[PDB]
Amino acid sequence: QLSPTELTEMRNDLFNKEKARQLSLTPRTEKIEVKHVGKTDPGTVFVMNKNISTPYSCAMHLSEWYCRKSILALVDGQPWDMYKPLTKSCEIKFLTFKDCDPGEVNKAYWRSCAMMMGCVIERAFKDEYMVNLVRAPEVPVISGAFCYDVVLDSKLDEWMPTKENLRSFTKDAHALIYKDLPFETLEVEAKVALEIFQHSKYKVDFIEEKASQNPERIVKLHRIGDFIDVSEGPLIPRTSICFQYEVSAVHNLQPTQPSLIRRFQGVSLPVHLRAHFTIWDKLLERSRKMVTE
Amino acid sequence: ISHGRVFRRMGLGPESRIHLLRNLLTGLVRHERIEAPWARVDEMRGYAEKLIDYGKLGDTNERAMRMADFWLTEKDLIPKLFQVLAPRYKDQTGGYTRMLQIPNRSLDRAKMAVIEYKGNCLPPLPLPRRDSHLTLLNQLLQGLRQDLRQSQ
Amino acid sequence: AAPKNRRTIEVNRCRRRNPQKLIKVKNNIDVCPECGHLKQKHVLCAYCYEKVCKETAEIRRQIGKQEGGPFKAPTIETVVLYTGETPSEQDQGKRIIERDRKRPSWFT
Amino acid sequence: ISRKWEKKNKIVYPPQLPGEPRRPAEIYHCRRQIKYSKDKMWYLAKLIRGMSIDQALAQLEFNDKKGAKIIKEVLLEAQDMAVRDHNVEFRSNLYIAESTSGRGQCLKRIRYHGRGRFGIMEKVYCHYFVKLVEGPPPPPEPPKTAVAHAKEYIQQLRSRTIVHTL
Amino acid sequence: KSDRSIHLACTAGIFDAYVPPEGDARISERMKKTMASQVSIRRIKDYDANFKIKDFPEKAKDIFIEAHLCLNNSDHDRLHTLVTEHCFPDMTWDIKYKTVRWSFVESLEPSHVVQVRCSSMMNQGNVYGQITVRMHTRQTLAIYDRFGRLMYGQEDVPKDVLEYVVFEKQLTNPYGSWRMHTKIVPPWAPPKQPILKTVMIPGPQLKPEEEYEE
Numbered sequence: 035q036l037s038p039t040e041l042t043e044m045r046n047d048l049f050n051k052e053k054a055r056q057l058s059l060t061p062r063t064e065k066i067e068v069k070h071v072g073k074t075d076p077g078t079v080f081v082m083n084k085n086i087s088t089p090y091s092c093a094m095h096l097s098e099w100y101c102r103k104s105i106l107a108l109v110d111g112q113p114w115d116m117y118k119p120l121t122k123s124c125e126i127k128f129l130t131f132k133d134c135d136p137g138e139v140n141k142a143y144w145r146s147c148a149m150m151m152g153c154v155i156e157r158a159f160k161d162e163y164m165v166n167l168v169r170a171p172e173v174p175v176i177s178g179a180f181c182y183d184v185v186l187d188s189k190l191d192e193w194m195p196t197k198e199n200l201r202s203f204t205k206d207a208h209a210l211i212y213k214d215l216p217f218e219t220l221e222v223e224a225k226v227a228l229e230i231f232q233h234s235k236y237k238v239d240f241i242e243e244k245a246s247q248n249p250e251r252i253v254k255l256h257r258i259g260d261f262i263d264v265s266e267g268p269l270i271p272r273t274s275i276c277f278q279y280e281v282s283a284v285h286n287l288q289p290t291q292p293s294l295i296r297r298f299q300g301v302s303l304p305v306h307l308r309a310h311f312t313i314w315d316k317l318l319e320r321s322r323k324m325v326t327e
Numbered sequence: 328i329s330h331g332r333v334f335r336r337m338g339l340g341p342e343s344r345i346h347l348l349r350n351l352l353t354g355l356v357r358h359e360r361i362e363a364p365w366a367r368v369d370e371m372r373g374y375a376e377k378l379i380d381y382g383k384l385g386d387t388n389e390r391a392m393r394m395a396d397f398w399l400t401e402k403d404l405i406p407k408l409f410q411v412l413a414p415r416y417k418d419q420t421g422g423y424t425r426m427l428q429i430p431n432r433s434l435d436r437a438k439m440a441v442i443e444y445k446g447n448c449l450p451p452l453p454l455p456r457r458d459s460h461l462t463l464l465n466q467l468l469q470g471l472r473q474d475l476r477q478s479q
Numbered sequence: 480a481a482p483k484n485r486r487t488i489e490v491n492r493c494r495r496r497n498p499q500k501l502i503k504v505k506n507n508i509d510v511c512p513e514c515g516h517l518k519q520k521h522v523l524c525a526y527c528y529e530k531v532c533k534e535t536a537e538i539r540r541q542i543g544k545q546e547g548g549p550f551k552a553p554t555i556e557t558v559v560l561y562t563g564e565t566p567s568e569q570d571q572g573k574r575i576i577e578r579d580r581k582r583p584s585w586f587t
Numbered sequence: 588i589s590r591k592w593e594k595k596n597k598i599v600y601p602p603q604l605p606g607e608p609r610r611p612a613e614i615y616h617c618r619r620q621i622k623y624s625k626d627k628m629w630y631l632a633k634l635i636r637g638m639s640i641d642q643a644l645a646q647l648e649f650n651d652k653k654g655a656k657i658i659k660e661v662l663l664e665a666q667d668m669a670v671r672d673h674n675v676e677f678r679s680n681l682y683i684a685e686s687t688s689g690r691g692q693c694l695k696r697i698r699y700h701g702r703g704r705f706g707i708m709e710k711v712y713c714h715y716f717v718k719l720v721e722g723p724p725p726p727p728e729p730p731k732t733a734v735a736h737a738k739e740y741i742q743q744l745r746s747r748t749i750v751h752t753l
Numbered sequence: 754k755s756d757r758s759i760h761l762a763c764t765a766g767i768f769d770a771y772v773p774p775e776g777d778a779r780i781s782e783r784m785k786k787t788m789a790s791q792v793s794i795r796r797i798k799d800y801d802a803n804f805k806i807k808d809f810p811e812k813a814k815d816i817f818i819e820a821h822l823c824l825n826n827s828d829h830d831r832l833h834t835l836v837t838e839h840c841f842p843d844m845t846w847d848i849k850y851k852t853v854r855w856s857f858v859e860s861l862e863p864s865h866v867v868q869v870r871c872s873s874m875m876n877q878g879n880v881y882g883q884i885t886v887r888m889h890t891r892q893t894l895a896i897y898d899r900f901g902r903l904m905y906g907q908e909d910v911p912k913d914v915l916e917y918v919v920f921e922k923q924l925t926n927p928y929g930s931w932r933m934h935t936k937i938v939p940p941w942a943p944p945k946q947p948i949l950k951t952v953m954i955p956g957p958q959l960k961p962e963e964e965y966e967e
């Protein structure tokens with residue numbers, strides 16, 4: 035059995051070696067052409083570097099405003115991470131929180147916040163007890179809370195967290211937000227994701243179903259610092275996008291057998307859409323309420 | 328001490344104040360959208376609302392005739408008022424004018440304003456619009472509204 | 480009254496570089512999203528407003544050409560048509576102002 | 588008169604070893620003989636010191652001064668020469684390191700007073716100097732903490748010696 | 754209407770430019786091109802009877818090599834000596850505040866005198882002769898900035914180059930010498946090595962009354 039520390043650096047080593055393998059697979063510089071087709075600054079051509087350049091690099095070419103407000107990128111109509119390297123000469127379009135249809139940006143935000151809460155739980159529970167992460171359900175924005183399913187210890191099968199425990203979870207999430215880590219992205223082979231997450235049967239099942247749904251068995255891994263997780267899609271650039279964060283509630287799922295799956299629910303709001311104290315309290319109460327998928 | 332003083336001290340006196348506001352009101356009725364300093368636009372906005380009320384009182388009213396004769400200095404805008412603007416606002420009750428702030432005059436850096444009568448034929452102003460309902464915060468508040476609806 | 484002594488550069492620097500004298504940084508600057516240009520939150524966008532002003536200046540030139548002289552304001556409503564469309568059945572008894580360009584996308 | 592700011596722009600450096608930091612780009616620009624007072628131009632420069640280039644352009648665009656418009660033009664052309672000749676990668680990746688205003692060559696005109704008295708008017712001119720450095724703007728210095736204040740007091744107390752003795 | 758006129762030492766044109774044959778790099782009327790090249794050879798022999806066309810290509814290779822070495826160490830008078838006045842500014846201006854590290858490794862095959870043309874008499878009393886030589890060698894290049902960071906190329910890696918370099922001499926000049934005039938790069942030449950930085954090409958800047966048309 036591996037200690038939590040050593041499983042952490044081995045996962046980090048595997049992630050770094052795969053990233054170095056992709057960068058070595060693209061050893062020579064190569065110029066691609068990116069056609070900014072946005073409504074603002076129309077028809078703008080960038081000559082980016084292949085598999086090195088980012089939509090953040092395109093935004094940094096344009097202006098600082100595009101860096102600070104652009105949360106996602108449409109590359110040929112598909113949602114693209116801001117720090118994900120570009121592969122092919124395409125058309126780009128930056129998406130912010132305050133667009134006419136911010137739905138993809140919302141999905142990326144809620145997925146990012148769920149993965150941050152999962153990291154908080156995993157590094158919050160004690161060494162003598164056991165933590166495993168099942169998945170983050172793709173729950174709609176309209177529900178009011180992000181959910182992470184965690185299998186906890188049989189010693190804590192009866193245990194219920196208290197208000198100070200939930201506030202400690204919130205303080206750890208705010209510590210991550212203050213640390214301001216970038217959301218590193220890796221498109222990886224299903225085999226490679228399997229030896230990365232080989233010591234988690236639920237992660238193996240999730241990786242297998244993602245490899246089943248796509249033809250080439252390429253899944254998406256994301257990293258904030260040392261925590262690595264499998265994602266359903268693209269994410270926000272930095273944890274500092276989150277401004278108001280709270281781990282509201284913890285619940286048990288209905289089937290206690292064979293194992294107790296606990297759904298952690300939280301609610302968050304970015305800097306660009308920060309709410310007032312009272313409105314935030316009402317959102318807190320709705321997030322404390324049950325969310326079913 | 329200017330407690331409870333609702334009127335601005337403009338021009339060379341009350342003469343010049345009413346004459347300046349009358350000229351601005353005339354330009355507004357003729358062109359349906361003018362730009363002017365912000366204080367003058369505010370005062371003339373109040374007068375424009377009351378003038379449309381008199382136009383809705385109507386041309387057969389001799390009092391409305393005398394008021395329009397005073398406050399319109401070209402005498403062709405009186406048919407325009409009484410047969411164009413009042414029928415345009417026969418359904419509305421008091422929301423006839425729109426004031427927006429335009430940044431600064433390029434010469435003396437005066438706070439500028441554009442005032443228009445609603446409706447119009449001119450190209451529309453770039454009005455400030457609220458955030459879309461598909462925004463994240465609006466979706467959470469809409470879900471809260473639904474939850475309160477099924478709760479009660 | 481006259482100065483009894485010459486004020487030194489230290490006292491002058493204190494008075495002239497007091498933070499009340501300095502220029503305050505503005506926080507209400509936002510990117511107008513119709514044209515991607517800088518605006519303030521409470522004012523209209525300068526670029527969009529100048530666009531509207533130039534278009535309505537062309538409209539008013541056409542209205543003046545159709546009017547032909549002072550003191551001839553019409554007693555009917557007015558609509559602007561561009562090239563490539565007919566006046567609709569609601570715009571029957573309205574003065575037609577014709578423009579020799581495509582209808583701009585922001586004009587409905 | 589002297590044009591050492593332009594000569595500073597024309598200074599060149601030796602080639603870089605492959606194992607040392609990247610030496611961020613420096614761009615010097617100036618405008619001379621501006622019909623404006625050097626004190627008011629100082630207020631504008633002290634406004635845009637240490638900002639990012641886009642932050643400075645926003646502040647100067649929504650300031651209400653002739654000097655603000657002039658400095659905005661100078662900043663735009665400095666950014667253009669930055670990413671046209673000095674190999675700056677991104678046009679937003681600049682900050683204002685130095686921004687100051689100097690005196691220019693002025694003119695003496697008469698100002699007619701009462702009686703037979705007269706004064707001398709000064710048609711004031713000024714220069715504007717700017718230096719743009721490639722990279723993100725440096726973080727503002729964090730305010731001194733009570734821990735640091737207690738630390739410096741303890742350091743003085745431990746630096747005390749017995750004076751005027753052996 | 755002064756008597757003194759500008760005494761130009763060279764021109765800025767190529768008399769009947771050598772169109773590079775397609776596939777000359779891919780593969781490792783001839784009488785007419787040959788008799789023209791040798792007509793101009795006769796004229797150059799008349800104006801100086803000590804010219805050997807067989808002895809030219811090593812001198813051309815030299816003039817190339819030391820011209821680029823004087824470009825390396827910014828030796829401008831020697832660049833004037835080995836380089837024509839039309840060739841100088843588009844060789845020096847773009848590197849005026851840059852450091853160029855150029856080196857000559859080897860020659861893959863010997864250079865070939867592929868074209869010889871000569872001017873007419875009526876060029877202000879001066880008659881010029883131009884010779885185009887195909888050069889196919891192996892070279893290194895590492896252009897640095899004003900700040901010493903690298904722009905272009907690699908420091909040590911040598912790469913193949915193909916070139917149709919054209920030299921010109923003022924034959925009527927008593928002190929004339931063979932100097933590099935221009936270079937013909939073919940229209941079918943392979944694309945250049947990519948630059949190491951990123952470039953944004955801005956779109957059309959629009960006045961407010963203008964509309965964006967695609």
Ligand SMILES: [Mg+2]
Pocket residue numbers: 337338
């Ligand atoms: Mg007054």
Ligand SMILES: [Zn+2]
Pocket residue numbers: 511512513514515516524525526527
């Ligand atoms: Zn705008």
